[PDB]
Design a protein around this ligand. Structure first.
Ligand SMILES: *C/C=C1/C(=C/c2[nH]c(/C=C3[NH+]=C(/C=C4/NC(=O)C(C=C)=C4C)C(C)=C\3CCC(=O)O)c(CCC(=O)O)c2C)NC(=O)[C@H]1C
Ligand SMILES: *C/C=C1/C(=C/c2[nH]c(/C=C3[NH+]=C(/C=C4/NC(=O)C(C=C)=C4C)C(C)=C\3CCC(=O)O)c(CCC(=O)O)c2C)NC(=O)[C@H]1C
Ligand SMILES: [Cl-]
Ligand SMILES: [Cl-]
Lengths: 307, 307
């Protein structure tokens, strides 16, 4: 509704996007308290994923009476127990599920996605091709164009752009790589207000941001066993963190059903964003995400060498 | 259909958009031979429209056995017969249907749409408001921005832009009026090749162009009785003329499900276009079309005085 959209825009610059208390439904999330060893939150769709690891779970309510050792891999639990630095995700795979868990304050946060084993030399070949091509770039402009062409080759997204920020955080589209029959966004300007400060902040917590489907219903976090601290839990280090309905609408209005964005960092400063938009919904596996982030990180070093 | 898309792009500048031998499905079309008063062409969906005029019609095969006096209002036929000028459309309404027919070459062409009687002063109020506001404009910039705001208020479309052509027919977006959560298209350039010559030509035959749903399937014109001339019939004087699948795909990739464009003319030269895009499909009645075209016509006259 128009008035609800207006009210969202009223408080949008201050919206707490790190604590949506909901997730995107392409995975499930558990939140466990470190000291009480108890599940304190579960995403609404937790049943349809964790039934694969423990066949005794049928509804969301069964999780309260479920045992963590039945839901998570033994390796993931022991890795969370001995990991001492905060917000460093541990990635553990089984035959059917793909877990990503980290330690944040007094909690363990576990995301899980479905996973399909893919055995091929394709990633090693793509990695070598990407690096040699980026090493050959000797001019600033040639590098960003090669990077945008490579990101498109790897992910298959319909349009891939690079935003560069100016000192005052306004964005300009400095290079583009798009399929035919698309409006050219090259040299488009957008104001700093379009990306709130806290939205830029997330790229320093997790350098990739993933929206596989702008029209999937966000799943909220249900309380399971009562926590000692009831403040909402920061979800920013993982990938399932739900998207602001505002931005989902913005993406719809542009004809975009799926997006993936990657931060470009010069030292610790955020210099720009690599953004990928797709007209149809689109899922990218964890390995493809890694390949994109590694390619962008390699490109950044060469870029600073060139300037 | 990527490969087929590429082959269509190959021949796009040469594509004959005036003779698509198909129509958009928000109406039905008959093409009748002038001398024999015989239906030589009918759009495939004619049944669901003319069933309202003769309920003994259920499907297209009934039209082959039909006589036009059974399908059309008698005054419309006598008006087409007695008219002496070509391509000047006659507009005839019944309680349930709205016909637009004209005289073209060897035939009488008739479009028919569904129609619902709506009784209110809304149109007179909008008309008065538009004229008084457009009369207050004292500068070129004031006029284009007021016009874009007014066209948006009248049609309710999500985005309304004004393209201005330069001497070599490249387009620049000089003014825009768009809802919140939309990428600003202000000052966007597009090359002359993006609007082929035959498409600009159409605005001189009919100043409004209407696409109420980019995802509706074009309905082809079927031969009924063999005509004396087998050359394709120019459909450009009406509004049902089917849209190039190329442009429909272009609009999808831009997030547009419905579009309406209106030509801005300085004497008979085409000076620009007023374009309306909507994220979801949208239908505009014949009265709304007349109001949009008259408002643009009034704005243009004020513009030439202003410069
Ligand atoms: C007041 C708050 C607003 C807001 C919030 C918001 N935006 C993002 C992410 C965006 N939004 C971008 C906007 C654009 N402007 C343009 O001109 C174009 C052109 C293609 C775009 C895309 C933008 C560039 C980003 C970052 C990268 C991206 O392209 O996705 C977020 C983050 C969403 C999240 O939770 O991940 C928020 C909260 N957007 C506004 O426009 C104003 C209203
Ligand atoms: C080689 C032929 C091509 C083609 C054909 C084509 N275009 C139109 C109508 C258009 N197309 C427009 C394209 C744009 N360029 C931009 O930068 C933007 C930005 C928003 C747009 C929309 C355009 C402005 C018009 C006229 C206005 C409108 O919105 O309709 C047609 C006519 C369609 C019809 O009614 O039959 C045709 C045939 N489009 C191409 O992109 C190239 C491939
Ligand atoms: Cl990940
Ligand atoms: Cl009409």
């Amino acid at each position: 509704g128009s008035d609800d959209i207006s009210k969202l825009i009223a408080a949008c610059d201050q919206e707490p996007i790190h604590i949506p208390n909901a997730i995107q439904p392409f995975g499930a999330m558990l939140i466990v308290e470190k000291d009480t060893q108890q599940i304190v939150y579960a995403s609404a769709n937790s049943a349809e994923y964790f039934s694969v690891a423990d066949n005794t779970i049928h509804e969301l309510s069964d999780i309260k009476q479920a045992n963590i050792n039945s839901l998570l891999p033994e390796h993931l639990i022991s890795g969370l127990a001995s990991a001492i630095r905060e917000n460093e995700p541990i990635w553990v795979e089984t035959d059917r599920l793909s877990f990503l868990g980290w330690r944040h304050e007094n909690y363990y946060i576990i995301e899980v996605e479905r996973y399909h084993v893919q055995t091929s030399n394709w990633f090693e070949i793509q990695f070598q091709r990407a690096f040699q091509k980026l090493r050959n770039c000797k001019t600033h402009n040639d590098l960003i164009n090669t990077l945008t062409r490579l990101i498109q080759e790897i992910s298959g997204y319909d349009r891939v752009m690079i935003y560069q920020f100016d000192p005052e955080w306004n964005g300009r589209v400095i290079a583009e790589s798009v399929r035919q029959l698309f409006t050219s966004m090259l040299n488009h300007h957008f104001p700093a207000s379009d990306i709130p400060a806290q939205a830029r902040a997330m790229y320093s917590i997790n350098p990739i941001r993933i929206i596989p489907d702008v029209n999937a219903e966000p799943q909220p976090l249900h309380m399971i066993h009562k926590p000692q601290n009831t403040e909402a839990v920061n979800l920013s280090s993982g990938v399932l963190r739900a998207v602001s309905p505002l931005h989902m609408q913005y993406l719809r209005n542009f004809g975009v059903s799926a997006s993936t964005s990657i931060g470009i960092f010069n030292e610790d400063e955020l210099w720009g964003i690599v953004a990928c938009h797709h007209t149809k919904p689109r899922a990218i596996g964890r390995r493809i995400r890694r390949l994109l982030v590694r390619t962008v990180e390699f490109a950044a070093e060469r870029l600073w060498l060139i300037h």
